[PDB]
């Protein structure tokens, strides 16, 4: 779209690379620092999608 | 409608007669790069599914 199509998502953050021919549609807040990622988001807290 | 990369959909084909040469007119693609078998002799081998 001229405004922009935002309907397509992808995964960026994971604990490790997955094996060939597997999928994972689970959504959770990745921990990217010593500060715990209890919920929502924050510094050193990344939403992978 | 096509699925997203993180939620790709698996579609199965079984118990039919295929013709891998009719797909040229379906979409305006050019490369059709293939790995394990030559595109020349796709309609001669017999698969499982």
């Amino acid at each position, epitope marked *: 779209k*001229v405004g922009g*199509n935002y309907n397509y998502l992808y995964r960026l953050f994971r604990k490790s690379n997955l094996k060939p021919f597997e999928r994972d549609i689970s959504t959770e807040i990745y921990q990217a620092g010593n500060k715990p990622c209890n919920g929502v988001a924050g510094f050193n807290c990344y939403f992978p999608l | 409608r096509f699925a997203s990369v993180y939620a790709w959909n698996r579609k199965r084909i079984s118990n039919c007669v295929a013709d891998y040469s009719v797909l040229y007119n379906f979409a305006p693609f050019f490369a059709f790069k293939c790995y394990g078998v030559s595109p020349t002799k796709l309609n001669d081998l017999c698969f499982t599914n």
Partner: antibody
Amino acid sequence: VQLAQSGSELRKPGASVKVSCDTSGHSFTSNAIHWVRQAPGQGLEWMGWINTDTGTPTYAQGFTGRFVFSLDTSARTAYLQISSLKADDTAVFYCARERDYSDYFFDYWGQGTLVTVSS
Amino acid sequence: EVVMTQSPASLSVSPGERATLSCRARASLGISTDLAWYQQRPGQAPRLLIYGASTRATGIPARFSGSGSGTEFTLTISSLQSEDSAVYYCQQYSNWPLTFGGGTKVEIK
């Protein structure tokens, strides 16, 4: 819902017909316009669509070549052009518009345009 | 390509009686709730009736109800009215030979 569409005309064989489809009545979260044709006594059948902001038409199987889809300089008013009318060419031509993006069901429809072939 | 078949061809029932129409699509892999219903009174253009499997659009009363899944779909109506003289069609937005059904010619006695 009530997009302004051109009225009916009477045409002789071999002439040309111009049909417009005004759009500015409402607000649209889409970038396409569609056309629907109906025979005088039969059902509905599609012909194609053109992409707004690109001006690229798309034709169906049995409605290629002779039909012409055009847009406006503002890319809002869509015009339909046909030439070399036949005796069986008489039908009604509608103009359908999408509701939201990637929602391929038509909600906004023009009132319809009638084309008659006679002498 | 996906093509519909619709029966019965025509309907002639007095107003106020429940009626059911079936639209079946001949597709090996099905449609998966990608169907819509349309109502076209003589004269004016067809107006949207039901989009999706059963959801209703804006400005339509809750009189109409629909159901179906996979390959077969059925429409149920109640409290038929005189002004509902129209021919009902079904459309699949599943592939990109966009086509319509054969239609059901519903007549008010």
